[PDB]
Amino acid sequence: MLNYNAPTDGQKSSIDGANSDQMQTFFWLKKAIITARKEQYFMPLASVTNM
Amino acid sequence: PKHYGKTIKVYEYVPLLDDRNINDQGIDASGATIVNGNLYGSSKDIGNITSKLPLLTENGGRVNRVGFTRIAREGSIHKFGFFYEFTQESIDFDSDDGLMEHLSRELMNGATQITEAVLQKDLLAAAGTVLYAGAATSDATITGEGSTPSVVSYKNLMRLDQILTENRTPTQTTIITGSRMIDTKVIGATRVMYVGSELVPELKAMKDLFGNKAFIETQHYADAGTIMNGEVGSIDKFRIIQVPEMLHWAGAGAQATGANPGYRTSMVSGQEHYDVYPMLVVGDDSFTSIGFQTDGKSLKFTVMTKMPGKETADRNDPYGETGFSSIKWYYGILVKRPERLALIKTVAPL
Amino acid sequence: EHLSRELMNGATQITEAVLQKDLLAAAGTVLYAGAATSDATITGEGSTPSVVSYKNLMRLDQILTENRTPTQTTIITGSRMIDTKVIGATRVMYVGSELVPELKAMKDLFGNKAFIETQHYADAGTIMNGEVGSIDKFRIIQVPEMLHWA
Amino acid sequence: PKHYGKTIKVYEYVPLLDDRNINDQGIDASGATIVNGNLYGSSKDIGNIT
Amino acid sequence: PELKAMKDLFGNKAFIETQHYADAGTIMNGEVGSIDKFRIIQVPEMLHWA
């Protein structure tokens, strides 16, 4: 039987030969995880003097 | 979607100043090449910061250079199913009608329970932040005998809270201010933690730093507060939820001698070993489910039923006296931020 | 877009660190916990470890009172709700994340607990950002990015 | 009711995943016959479930 | 009496009499108190094995 076994691992699909492999094995979300800016406590305390 | 394999991947972008950002683009203030690109890692030393500060003269050429990095994640899906079969005489001559309804109901309930267990074990396996009670460093080192038994304590919960706060994990709940009724006390807990039914007595026996009772039951703060489903109490900053079907590792602990003071044990290969219990904490946006042709749901169940008759007639059975029923589904999980999952492994009293 | 965002975030963080280290360097009144008289004399092993205690905070408040430093906060009187305590903390203190367990485990002169959590006085009071509690005259504020000598 | 003797009887249907469910209709994932029909009893062991 | 002499995990009094929670609650007939999560009812004619 023609089987899709585990192309990512050592196993290969039944239809694929010695010189072939699957073009698309995974899927991409396109939405990246990001980290927010740190908070700062000391900056609001300062008062500005013009130079 | 279809025709894309059985895997989903995603990128994560590391900030500039973390230790995970490793590269060779660095150039220090003197202009010489340097090993690390980021100015300084997650280091709070004043000496290191002073040494590695970016300073400029009037003419600044090729003085300070930086770099960046990104990380990738992945997850996969699997397939499950089971079935049963019967005859026509068993249905026609049986004492009570409606047996098929009972069988179908039990089949569906079993399927749902198996789905829940499969999800829970994956969540337990994929935990990122792990603490071991006592002096243990792994599952095999967990024991209830010796100078330091592997039992959860107040300081372990405090350390878990400190780590979660450091990871910038969001808080689930809000604090509770007191009411006017006598014998009612305040509880400032802001996170939710799930425990099994076996660990509750040990939590009840816990004491805080000053020897007072640490486990506050729900009847104390039921007024002026909202009680979650299955909640049993609150310790420190966590609110305890009791899950009926919480799983555990049996026999994963160290070998048990005759000096056992009353903790649960199990027999593995003719030898007695201790048990390990999860004490799980799940943060917000930690994971997501993968749905394959589920119409926007986590699970979709497919059921096929064939009754006895001409459709079941075959070469092996020319009369067609058999039938069956089956059910199957797809499941998979993707973990985005593993650090938001927390776990505390400990033994439980008998 | 990602590169520019991370660049700006790093710039802001660096400026915050520089301001904090300058403020720490420019301190006028300095107390050393324990019997230490300098950084090299600070130690954790011996008859008297150099760990903060109640008397050090009392001395700091006394020195600030002698200096005629203005007060930041007013006291809090009791509330009607059960299990609510009164606090007369008057000044604001910034500590790192590492010192919080030590502050929580600290006890006063007579053996009782000194640290008072925010849940007790949240009613009939205002809670500042990143505040863990109040000890004696000071209200403790936890700053994630506090710098330490190593 | 009258004319039915002196005895009353009823049924109770046990769930699929109980330990009281003892039967011979069992085939494992490999395909070989096994003693127990229910997948697993009231066992919370992760190893056994896996 | 044996229930009244019982001690809890910390060594304090486990038994709680009805006069404490008679207000803001309904006292069942024959109730003498409460221990843990059970409400104790005293039956005059409880039988025993001798």
Side-chain angles (χ1 to χ4, degrees), chain B residues 13-17 39-40 44-46 49-50 53-54 66 68 158 162 165 175-188 209-210 237, chain C residues 2-3 6-7 10 13-14 17-18 21 24 80-83 97-98 101 104-107 111 113 119-120 122-123 142 144-150:
Chain B
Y13 280 83
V14 187
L16 167 66
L17 288 177
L39 277 296
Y40 48 86
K44 311 179 181 308
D45 190 334
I46 304 188
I49 291 181
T50 304
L53 268 181
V66 294
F68 308 92
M158 264 163 83
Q162 184 180 8
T165 300
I175 68 177
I176 281 176
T177 63
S179 188
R180 294 222 189 161
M181 313 278 167
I182 313 293
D183 210 318
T184 285
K185 63 180 72 175
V186 297
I187 297 89
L209 308 169
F210 292 98
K237 300 294 187 291
Chain C
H2 297 300
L3 298 196
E6 310 286 3
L7 189 87
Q13 190 170 357
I14 289 176
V18 175
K21 66 171 289 299
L24 291 179
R80 296 290 210 90
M81 312 308 192
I82 304 296
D83 209 297
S97 177
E98 289 86 350
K104 290 183 175 180
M106 181 185 38
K107 46 183 52 162
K113 74 171 312 203
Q119 51 247 47
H120 294 102
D123 214 327
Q142 181 179 337
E145 291 315 345
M146 272 295 267
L147 312 171
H148 69 275
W149 302 269

Side-chain angles (χ1 to χ4, degrees), chain B residues 95-96 99 106 113 117 121 244-250, chain D residues 11 13-17 39-40 43-46 49-50:
Chain B
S95 296
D96 70 326
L99 181 68
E106 311 285 3
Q113 188 172 342
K121 65 167 294 300
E245 183 65 26
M246 202 75 178
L247 313 174
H248 65 273
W249 304 266
Chain D
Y11 286 164
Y13 286 85
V14 304
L16 167 67
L17 287 184
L39 278 298
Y40 54 91
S43 51
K44 321 283 200 42
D45 195 332
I46 297 191
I49 289 176
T50 306

Side-chain angles (χ1 to χ4, degrees), chain E residues 32-50:
Chain E
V32 298
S34 174
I35 297 169
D36 186 74
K37 313 184 91 43
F38 295 99
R39 310 193 70 178
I40 305 297
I41 307 285
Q42 179 186 333
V43 177
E45 309 293 31
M46 211 76 195
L47 305 176
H48 68 271
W49 302 263

Side-chain angles (χ1 to χ4, degrees), chain C:
Chain C
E1 198 271 329
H2 297 300
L3 298 196
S4 302
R5 198 198 42 233
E6 310 286 3
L7 189 87
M8 265 296 316
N9 295 354
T12 57
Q13 190 170 357
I14 289 176
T15 63
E16 179 52 5
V18 175
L19 169 61
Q20 195 190 147
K21 66 171 289 299
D22 282 6
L23 275 178
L24 291 179
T29 302
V30 179
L31 282 72
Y32 303 91
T37 66
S38 70
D39 285 9
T41 48
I42 284 187
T43 187
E45 42 175 50
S47 58
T48 50
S50 303
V51 59
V52 68
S53 71
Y54 209 72
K55 307 171 92 212
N56 296 343
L57 299 180
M58 293 177 70
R59 260 194 80 70
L60 193 60
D61 180 53
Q62 182 204 310
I63 293 177
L64 286 179
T65 306
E66 298 185 347
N67 274 26
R68 310 182 76 186
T69 307
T71 58
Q72 284 103 309
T73 308
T74 188
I75 69 169
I76 283 163
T77 54
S79 178
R80 296 290 210 90
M81 312 308 192
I82 304 296
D83 209 297
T84 288
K85 320 202 259 194
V86 300
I87 295 89
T90 301
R91 289 181 176 91
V92 180
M93 175 163 262
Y94 298 97
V95 310
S97 177
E98 289 86 350
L99 268 175
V100 187
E102 183 37 78
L103 292 174
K104 290 183 175 180
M106 181 185 38
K107 46 183 52 162
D108 64 1
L109 316 161
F110 294 135
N112 311 319
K113 74 171 312 203
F115 198 87
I116 299 179
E117 280 94 0
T118 62
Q119 51 247 47
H120 294 102
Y121 64 81
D123 214 327
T126 56
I127 284 299
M128 291 146 168
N129 278 56
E131 152 165 18
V132 294
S134 65
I135 276 175
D136 183 305
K137 292 313 202 43
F138 302 99
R139 305 193 72 174
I140 314 289
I141 305 280
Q142 181 179 337
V143 181
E145 291 315 345
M146 272 295 267
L147 312 171
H148 69 275
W149 302 269

Side-chain angles (χ1 to χ4, degrees), chain D residues 18-38:
Chain D
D18 213 358
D19 291 77
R20 294 132 57 191
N21 189 345
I22 307 171
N23 49 7
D24 291 331
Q25 283 104 30
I27 301 176
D28 63 358
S30 176
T33 307
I34 49 167
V35 297
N36 58 76
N38 49 0

